[PDB]
Amino acid sequence: LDMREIPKSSIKPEHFHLMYLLEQHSPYFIDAELTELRDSFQIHYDINDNHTPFDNIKSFTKNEKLRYLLNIKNLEEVNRTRYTFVLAPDELFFTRDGLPIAKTRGLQNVVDPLPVSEAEFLTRYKALVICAFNEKQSFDALVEGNLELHKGTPFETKVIEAATLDLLTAFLDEQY
């Protein structure tokens, strides 16, 4: 969870000189360190106390939980940059202000991860909301299942049915 290996043959030779971007400070990502081996690049993540894992929010007061959940949408700012990210519990951290920070970084047209459709970003966001409100739930199971066939609480149905990202935001705002 704290190391990533990238084989060199997966990277076009003319893109080697961009791998340093994976260790450049970004306000949207965990700080990272790049090393270069014979046949691969490796990344180590700096995961320290100022970054709160997503799963820690499950025990928060409803107000603060909702604040953090609402702020997750700020990761959409990453789409204007070179970088890509994955939305998932083990990929998501928060600053001391409750702003989201991702771990793994790709680079457009250069190295995976590939970005996900808007629809799959919404499903993953929904799954995070559900997990934050019920610690028994599995993010993976929610993302992998037939979501509208989910059996759960009325709250969970409302989250699942939110038609768009903006309507999910509106639902979350309404829960205050």
From Swiss-Prot:
Subcellular location per UniProt equals: Cell membrane
**Top-rank lineage group of the source organism:** Bacteria
Q: Which residues lie on this side of the membrane: Cytoplasmic?
A: 1-176
User: What organism, scientifically named, is this protein from?
Assistant: Staphylococcus aureus (strain NCTC 8325 / PS 47)
Designated name of the protein:
Type VII secretion system protein EssB
Q: Quote the range of the complete protein represented.
A: 30 to 205 of 444
Identify the taxonomic lineage of the organism of origin.
Answer: Bacteria, Bacillati, Bacillota, Bacilli, Bacillales
The UniProt subunit note reads as follows: Homodimer.
Protein purpose: Component of the type VII secretion system (Ess). Required for the secretion of EsxA and EsxB.
Family statement: Belongs to the EssB family.
